[PDB]
């Protein structure tokens, strides 16, 4: 089965792409990474940094997750990210997304040994 660490990579990692403005990016990526298959995932963030640099966040600042869990980690630097959010007309199975580039600290929940990102929690 897909591991928790691989699911994070499929859902949130896009290291090869730059922060260049790209208005259709989320419509393309939300489908390609299977985040529109069973429902429209309402919000999803992709990170344009290396996998090593994102895995390293699990050793950075321990902070509370949005839900109250306490195994989240905030990156010391802001990172090049893309926020994908459903549009007002989006309705499954016809999902549609707005793309927004940002530079923000990422917050991920980490698990396992080795200790790696398994959930993308927030950017601030």
């Amino acid at each position, epitope marked *: 089965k897909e591991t928790a660490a691989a699911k994070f990579e499929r859902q949130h990692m896009d290291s090869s792409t730059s922060a260049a403005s790209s208005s259709n990016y989320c419509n393309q990526m939300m489908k390609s990474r299977n985040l529109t298959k069973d429902r429209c995932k309402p919000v999803n963030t992709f990170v344009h940094e290396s996998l090593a640099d994102v895995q390293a966040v699990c*050793s950075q600042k321990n902070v509370a997750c949005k839900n109250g*869990q306490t195994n989240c980690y905030q990156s010391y630097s802001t990172m090049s990210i893309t926020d994908c959010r459903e549009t007002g007309s989006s309705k499954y199975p016809n999902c549609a997304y707005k793309t927004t580039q940002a530079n923000k600290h990422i917050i991920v929940a980490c698990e396992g040994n080795p200790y790696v990102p398994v959930h993308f929690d927030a950017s601030v």
Partner: nanobody
Amino acid sequence: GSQVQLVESGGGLVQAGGSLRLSCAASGYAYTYIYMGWFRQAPGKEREGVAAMDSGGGGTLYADSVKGRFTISRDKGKNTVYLQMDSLKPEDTATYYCAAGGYELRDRTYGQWGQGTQVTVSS
């Protein structure tokens, strides 16, 4: 210095009915771990959470088999956690591990681990 290290002390060999104190001080991390806790692996058994506590001294949780006998504390230094173990039983024999940076007693959520300290309770 550059590495996070969870330094464990105390533990060791003790007779049943006796007491031990385990201590763990994390060095190398400049901020505060929200949760720290103690885990153990007894001979013949999977690793289990023994006690955990958040940096405010709250969120305190204990394995049912040690409630009323073990006391966890975090009031004795930044990123330090102590486990006072009284009325020790032979089945408390195990390698005890300090852990930091996780949530409650869920061992998969903790990313920093001590190397493990033997506790042996003889009958």
